[model samples]
Target: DRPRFSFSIAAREGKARTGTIEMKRGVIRTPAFMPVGTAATVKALKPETVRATGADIILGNTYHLMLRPGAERIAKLCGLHSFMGWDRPILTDSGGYQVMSLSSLKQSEEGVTFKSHLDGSRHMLSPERSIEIQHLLGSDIVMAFDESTPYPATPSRAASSMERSMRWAKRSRDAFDSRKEQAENAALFGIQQGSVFENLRQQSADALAEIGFDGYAVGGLAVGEGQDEMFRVLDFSVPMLPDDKPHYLMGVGKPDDIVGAVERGIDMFDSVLPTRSGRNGQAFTWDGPINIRNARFSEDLKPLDSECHCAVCQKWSRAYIHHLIRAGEILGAMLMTEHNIAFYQQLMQKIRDSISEGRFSQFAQDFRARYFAR
Candidate 1:
């Protein structure tokens, strides 16, 4: 037997805190950074290697999985963990985000209808179907199906979308609990969606609270809404959810954005930056992001980040990586991806330690000063 999913805060400094999320497969450290594994696997690296990077969890996309191998196929193979060989906690998105963004669709009160981006095969994703797909995948953390409000939308348009998402959230909740066996093991998180208006955010938060959930996510902020505006929304939005529940900030960004969100009280995050950038010759360091493809690295031989102790940094030089990238080598992507993931994990460890030690403010200030000065 295992927890239906439990989150406990270990320490707090201002709005920032350190904690652990207990799930059946593993314990996830918070504030955690989950690398996106879009289609059953984290791109360019093996799961064990990802595990070695100090990651307790990784994210999978329901939209991608449902399209590629089909949900039924995964269920027949004994779920995503066994199929992919990653035995840690996995959080799966509800496919709502991708449905609205990637698929050309027709929306109704029931669900979304669209042609699959894979082959133009038609599909429909309702709340029940979304939850069922996640259950089929055996997700440890299942996000409720809901639409993200578009940026710069009129108040009426925002309200219309937010209200619809709330209805969808209720349906998603009921659907998740439909299976007693699954309900006892997997946990569901509700999404709070309102463009940027405090009133709308408060409305969405209250609606989600009424529905209740294992955790809560602040959605719709990082959709082209600038950091300052995103922060403003969180200043008022996060406190409305149950303080006992884990608060996830969906699809959030760069290293600095993560630091800022944690300071504003978010506890979980996932993004494609580190891995996607790795493939593009970009690397994140304590100093900030740098392009390894620069001609300046042609002969400058040093580790990508002198501060990094990952196997990549321990064994290879920046000049060699630059050479591989310039030549479009796959191993270069693999090495760079692992190092960036490790860097993010190290940053999370620092954040947790700083909070527990009660010196997060100073630690953040000093780190940012150095990080930005580069």
Candidate 2:
């Protein structure tokens, strides 16, 4: 059903939705959050453990994979899922954002080109090439290659960048259609760009719709613009996107942010917080986010979260986790990573349940209250 793409809402509460994305590899539920497996591993946690955490899909890193293991090599080894062992559904990024972040190593113009941060290897990635790489890697859902401009920019800068992304989107679509793997089992999603301006975002969204894509992602957010601005853009931007397709928000943030974006009609999201924060001694709980490194936790004997159902919560104490983290144990990353993934999966489940019961409004309110009350 993918490559041609199909999406349907199983439930809806205002803009909130519980839906599914039909794909050749598998199905991804609406308002689904994909765990970031940027380098192909979700760090410390096994693929089955990640699936147990309730993820319907995972994201792959084009930049990192293309550099270290090499895209061609990953294909030879078997697709990302077989290599990583999480073979449900995999969405590979364009290798654009990650590459652009390497300022010292990259230059963007007639399609971004950069040097590998890993081995000083030089490479060029245009929309067509990005599309081609996703095919080679056997990505189930491929992100369009485009630039993500920061907000608070001049109107001209914002508009120009969006226009360039639109132009590249056409090339990306054409390249995917022309892929030797021609219409084989994968979907190509075009990213909607345009800093923060509502009109600009609409322009980008409308253009992408015109060019046609398997799905659409709200790119260029969760960078540093903060939540208020991101929500504002979502409010206006989401409505402008095609309703029948999945609306993904790239690099979305913390638990609270996902709740907010879900309310704005975002059907898909990916972020590194849960895994990254877990490794950094912090844990997200219903009461709020807590850092195990705090002096108060040195002797605290409570589980990471009373509300969490993760094994970490079921079997360990904050004191033990604190000890592990402070002592720099490998098990620390594993336990934290496991729990964090579980916590996020739990969060997505609650959101889906809330939407189904038509209680999302009140549920979201209570969530924010308890989450930030601490």
Candidate 3:
């Protein structure tokens, strides 16, 4: 029988490591970047297109799904993978972050009560309910429900928030375990939330460790604390989690951010940067990001990224893409999204390779030099 979930480190360079996460659906290469599939779709690209970009897994949002089509509706349609036409591994968030961000919400000891941004519908997303929703959605990796503590929080406020999340994590674990069938095939991850304080992070990590989880995520940092502060937090936060399981950094950002996080021992990441940027006419390249809608590209014939080998880059010129975006053609978004995702995947592959070869330090330096070069 296939394993429910397992992670093995293939190489280690300083704090950086490269590995694989094996699940029933597929093997996720670390450091891996998961494209965000908010609302059951990755926005402009098809499932096959996303797969073709070398992604082994994609992320789905529980908050959006439960509010819009509803989890029961998707369950009746055979879950999100079938509903979205993506058969690969799908990790659904616990809806905690979205509840805090997208909806008008009130948080308490039990859970969150929020008004739906869609239609002002009332919803309660407790820890147990969050797990049940993920099970119903048939998520391969289920995240524990916890409040994403706001940044720059007072020390006392941060502690209270972190403590509450730990309590919620315990509830999430029990709820997940109660679903015997779902537990047999899916893995549950606990989120560690302490705003920026080291002691709080250690306490949060220790609490999560006591409860235990298949994996652990370093949360609450990327919530507007700058890269330096986030990395500083991770410097202490990551080492506290079990090294044997995958270390996920939630809502991580730009290409440079991913590289830095990976260097700090983060194995998994998810963000809407690539897909959203593509729709807004930004394309990431080996050197840097470019705006394809720029007037300079109107007649200048070149691939979006000369180093990219994705179908979009190989087949279409920048001039054509610029024209398409300027003319408001849908294919413009599709092609750009395809290439951006491919770029992110390619970056991950390189990061993994450099670590395996024990040259990650050199690779990181060189990559930053080129990437930040204007």
lDDT of 1: 0.91
Over 1-374, each residue of candidate 3 has an lDDT whose tens digit, in order, gives: 55889899999999998999999999899999999999999999999999999999999999999997999999999999999899989999998888887899877898889999989999999999999999999999999999776667889989998999999999999999999998999999999987889999999999999999999999887777899988899999999999898999999889999999998989999999999999899999988999988899999778999889899988999999998998889999999899999999999999999999999999999999999994
**Model 2 residue 162 distance off true place after TM-score fit, in angstroms:** 0.8
lDDT of model 2 at position 202: 85
What is the C-alpha local distance difference test score of candidate 2?
Answer: 0.86
Please, what is the TM-score per model? 0.98, 0.96, 0.99
What TM-score would candidate 1 get against the native?
A: 0.98
Give the per-residue Cα lDDT of candidate 1 at 174: 96
Model 2, 1-374: lDDT tens digits are 24335688899999988978877667787789889998889989898889888888998888888886888998899877788888788899998887767633444656876777877778888988888788878888888888766546778888888899999899888888887563667888989988888888988988999999878999889887899989998999998988878899999879999999999999898989999999998898999989988888889889999988888898999999999999999999899889988888899999999999999999999999999898
Candidate 2 C-alpha error for residue 68, in Å? 1.0
1 against 3, candidate with superior lDDT: 3
Clashing pairs in model 1, backbone N/Cα/C closer than 3 A: none
What would the TM-score be for candidate 3 when compared with the true structure? 0.99
For candidate 2, the C-alpha RMSD (Å) to the true structure equals: 1.7
Q: What is the clash count for each candidate, in the order shown? A: 0, 1, 0
324 in model 1: Cα distance from truth in Å?
0.7
- How far residue 208's Cα lies from its native spot in candidate 1, in Å, is 1.1
